[PDB]
Scaffold this active site. Structure first.
Site, PDB file in Angstrom:
ATOM      1  CB  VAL A 154      -1.031   0.008   1.146  1.00 55.15           C
ATOM      2  CG1 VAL A 154      -2.104  -1.045   0.908  1.00 55.15           C
ATOM      3  CG2 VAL A 154      -0.349  -0.214   2.480  1.00 55.15           C
ATOM      4  N   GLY A 155       2.146   1.139   0.271  1.00 52.57           N
ATOM      5  CA  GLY A 155       3.015   2.305   0.261  1.00 52.57           C
ATOM      6  C   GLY A 155       4.307   2.182   1.046  1.00 52.57           C
ATOM      7  CE  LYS A 162       6.155   1.733  10.754  1.00 52.06           C
ATOM      8  NZ  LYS A 162       5.609   3.003  11.336  1.00 52.06           N
ATOM      9  CG  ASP A 198       1.822   9.040  10.688  1.00 50.20           C
ATOM     10  OD1 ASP A 198       1.909   7.838  11.021  1.00 50.20           O
ATOM     11  OD2 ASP A 198       1.729   9.403   9.490  1.00 50.20           O
ATOM     12  N   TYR A 243      10.904   5.256   6.028  1.00 46.57           N
ATOM     13  CA  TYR A 243      11.024   4.609   7.330  1.00 46.57           C
ATOM     14  C   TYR A 243      10.640   3.128   7.277  1.00 46.57           C
ATOM     15  N   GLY A 244       9.865   2.749   6.265  1.00 48.75           N
ATOM     16  CA  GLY A 244       9.387   1.382   6.155  1.00 48.75           C
ATOM     17  C   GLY A 244       8.479   1.209   4.958  1.00 48.75           C
ATOM     18  CB  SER A 245       7.761  -1.562   2.746  1.00 44.87           C
ATOM     19  OG  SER A 245       9.012  -1.215   2.178  1.00 44.87           O
ATOM     20  CB  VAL A 246       2.771   0.142   4.882  1.00 42.47           C
ATOM     21  CG1 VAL A 246       1.474  -0.243   5.584  1.00 42.47           C
ATOM     22  CG2 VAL A 246       3.619   1.011   5.789  1.00 42.47           C
TER      23      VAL A 246
HETATM   24 MG   LIG Z   1       1.489  11.135   8.305  1.00 41.39          MG
END
Ligand SMILES: [Mg+2]
Ligand SMILES: COC(=O)[C@@H](C)c1cc(OC)ccn1
Ligand SMILES: [Cl-]
Ligand SMILES: [Cl-]
Ligand SMILES: [Cl-]
Ligand SMILES: [Cl-]
Ligand SMILES: [Cl-]
Length: 344
Positions: A26-27, A46, A161, A28-31
């Site tokens: 779906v999209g 994540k 966040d 610091y990390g991969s998710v």
């Molecule tokens: Mg954000």
């Protein structure tokens, strides 16, 4: 220990417990989005990128895990699970974090809806309810803005966040990453505190009332000029609190301006909303209303319940002033992964 299974999805190896199915990027990390068969929730998984590549990065990994493990409130993102495929500290390398999959944010409604005053009351009430909890643990969010607020079909809201300590390029120019920041942090005027988050709430509330960004500056200086035109230039009392002599000199170079009439800026708005905005958007952070005080303001009379606005357990942040080696931060993180206990 659960059984793990491996798969390569978009150039990345994912090794996760069998409970997580139908992973989809779906999209610091991969998710990835996934279905959690243990709970029945659609979740976001994540995989952290290079969590222990430097002392700074290893400490940031520990900071994020500590904060997510602590947050237990209806209006704040919480941690559903955390896992590693490693069987021991010796082979520990990867960290995965699991949260509820969020859909729309406050942008996906502020741009695309007609909001009644009742909608504004409920959305801002929920932000302040979560902030009372966050601030009671001596945590500062630092990055409140519409894209960091998740909202569902029933107008229910969660804060996400948290600021984990944004870059110079990211704050430059005509960018939403800066439009919600308090002036004392945007220009490094002084040591800041939790009052910065209340400035952000005022900027968000104004935008829900008008449909327009309150302070859409083209750069730091343009944004300061927009702020001072609304709230007035500072008096000697606030100037004394600004640490930089150059910053004080710059402010004193501007022509003085009075605070504007907020009823003539927010034309037609509920007079109680205008009153609350005047109490949030105060230049001197010492004089802003707090989250706990704002929950008792008459604008929220139909939602305020002082027996259902909880505070947080104490949060020990002494690690922030501690100096450790990469592998010591890594070991502390491993301990926190292993000791996680899921919510009910
Ligand atoms: Mg954000
Ligand atoms: C010591 O107090 C001041 O210098 C205040 C009255 C002040 C503020 C300014 O904000 C634009 C400009 C000039 N003088
Ligand atoms: Cl499993
Ligand atoms: Cl949650
Ligand atoms: Cl690993
Ligand atoms: Cl945003
Ligand atoms: Cl002047």
């Amino acid at each position: 220990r659960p059984t793990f299974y491996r798969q390569e999805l978009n150039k990345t190896i994912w090794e996760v417990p069998e409970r997580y199915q139908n992973l989809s990027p779906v999209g610091y990390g991969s998710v990835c989005a996934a279905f959690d068969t243990k709970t029945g929730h659609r979740v976001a998984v994540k995989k952290l990128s290079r969590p222990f590549q430097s002392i700074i990065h290893a400490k940031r990994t520990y900071r994020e895990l500590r904060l997510l493990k602590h947050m237990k409130h209806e209006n704040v993102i919480g941690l559903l699970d955390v896992f590693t495929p490693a069987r021991s500290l010796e082979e520990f390398n990867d960290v995965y974090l699991v949260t509820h999959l969020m859909g729309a944010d406050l942008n996906n409604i502020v741009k695309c809806q007609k909001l009644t005053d009742d909608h504004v009351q409920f959305l801002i009430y929920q932000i302040l309810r979560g902030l009372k909890y966050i601030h009671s643990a001596d945590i500062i969010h630092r990055d409140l803005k519409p894209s960091n607020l998740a909202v569902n079909e029933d107008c229910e809201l969660k804060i996400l966040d948290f600021g984990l300590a944004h870059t110079d390029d990211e704050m430059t120019g005509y960018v939403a990453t800066r439009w919600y920041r308090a002036p004392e942090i945007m220009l490094n005027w002084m040591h800041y505190n939790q009052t910065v988050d209340i400035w952000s709430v005022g900027c968000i509330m104004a935008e829900l009332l008008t449909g327009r960004t309150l302070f859409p500056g083209t750069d730091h200086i343009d944004q300061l000029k927009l702020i001072l035109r609304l709230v007035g230039t500072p008096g000697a009392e606030l100037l004394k609190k600004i640490s930089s002599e150059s910053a004080r000199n710059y402010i004193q170079s501007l022509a003085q301006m009075p605070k504007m009439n907020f009823a003539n800026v927010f034309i037609g708005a509920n007079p109680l909303a205008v009153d609350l905005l005047e109490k949030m958007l105060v230049l001197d952070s010492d004089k802003r209303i707090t989250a706990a005080q704002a929950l008792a303001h008459a604008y929220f009379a139909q939602y305020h319940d002082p027996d259902d606005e909880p505070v947080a357990d104490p949060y020990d942040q002494s690690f922030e002033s501690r100096d450790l080696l990469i592998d010591e931060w890594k070991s502390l993180t491993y301990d926190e992964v292993i000791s996680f206990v899921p919510p009910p």
